[model samples]
Target: PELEVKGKKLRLDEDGFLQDWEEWDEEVAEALAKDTRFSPQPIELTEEHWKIIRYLRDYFIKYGVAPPVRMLVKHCKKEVRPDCNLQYIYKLFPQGPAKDACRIAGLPKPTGCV
Candidate 1:
């Protein structure tokens, strides 16, 4: 399938995730986040969500991979908030961080239970 974002036809995988992470931009990110088909539940792209999304994208850009949920939360604690935890993160992304969050961030399908 494909997503039409600001006239660009973004390719999506069979599971509805973006096919190429490099083709994503902020507008594409927002569009993907609002699409229920891309997530287990609808998302509103709140400030908290952008924080995680940007963090994940930056991590992928730097490390060439997405961080696991544990490492994501740990990075959040040190960078985003002092009290970040699984519950808080899960509340923002109910479909599991590595799945839903990475998808919205236009990251490749992560490996394992990350």
Candidate 2:
């Protein structure tokens, strides 16, 4: 999928990530920052900031599905601790799943999910 960054077209490379964060535009960065729900605390992203984005992207690509909290917890046991379940991820994405990271990453909302 192609993502629009600062009016420029962006697509994931074979590695399933942007070629470089520098490729993103200032406007896109602003959007990411403005969207506090899905973005990082400060709404900044770099090539190294793939931990969250990569996880979301990989899950969507692999299952063609979006796992709810319980399912997500069961699936990625390491990601969720005993007390920290889907809410952990949810904490960063109060708007749910789709727009949070997807908006910042420049990808479309996940199918059948938000």
Candidate 3:
């Protein structure tokens, strides 16, 4: 889906993050970096970190809701890498993955999530 903010067309997947959120949005992500601003640290891009961010964004676009913590953990394990578990995810995104990345990426906080 495409978003026109202030009449400028912004590219987004249906979830509202740039289609390549994990790869190239670090500067944009930094805009929401402070924890007090959005309840989570902005995603620090590493290959593993991107794997989680992109996966979460894609999941939100497909499902229209943020994955629950347990589901997110399961998704990381099953979909991205077996080592991609909740603890690791939390270390990467202290304020919570969905909240931090979604806020920076400019999507609604995942429903039924913190």
Candidate 4:
């Protein structure tokens, strides 16, 4: 599929991950967040939402893959935000962090258990 961001069409895979990670930007992220096509229910991109998304993007850039949920929660608790936890993460992304957040962050589909 494709989406128009700043007048340019960005591609998405069947599971809604960006076809090219380099094509990602806040505009693209906002567009994806507003759409319910990738999740079981709709979610508004609030400040907290951007926090997780941005963190995932940064982690992917540094490590070349999405961080596992355990490490994610650990890092979040230590650095991202004290309120970051499994329950809170699930509350933000009902479809769960690994899939939904990574999709919005424009990372490749996680290879193993995430």
**Residue 108 local lDDT, model 3:** 54
Better of 1 and 4 by lDDT: 1
- lDDT (10s digit) by residue, model 2, range 1-114: 344655677654432334444465446645554543433454444432345555655565576554444554454455435565556656655554554554444344344543
On residues 1-114, what C-alpha lDDT tens digit does candidate 4 reach at each position?
Answer: 887789888887778778777988998887777666776676787888887788888988998888888876876686667878898888888888866788888786754327
| TM-score between model 4 and native | 0.86
Q: Tally clashing residue pairs in candidate 4.
A: 0
Whole-model lDDT values for every prediction: 0.81, 0.49, 0.56, 0.78
**1 against 3, candidate with superior TM-score:** 1
- Give candidate 4's error at residue 15 in angstroms: 0.5
Misplaced by over 4 Å in model 2 are 1-50, 75-77
Q: Which 10 consecutive positions of candidate 2 have the poorest summed lDDT?
A: 13-22
Sorted on lDDT, highest at the top, how do the candidates line up? 1, 4, 3, 2
> How does each model score on TM-score?
0.88, 0.46, 0.57, 0.86
Task: Indicate the residue-level lDDT of 50 in model 2.
Answer: 42
Q: Considering every candidate listed, which one attains the maximal TM-score? A: 1
Which tens-of-lDDT digit does each residue in 6-106 have in candidate 3?
44454555433444433434454454443243343344566666666666666676877766677767767876678886677777777566655555544
User: Which candidate model has the greater lDDT, 2 or 4?
Assistant: 4
After aligning candidate 3 to the native by TM-score, how far in Å is the CA of 100 from where it should be? 2.1
Alpha-carbon shift of residue 44 in model 2 (angstroms)? 5.4
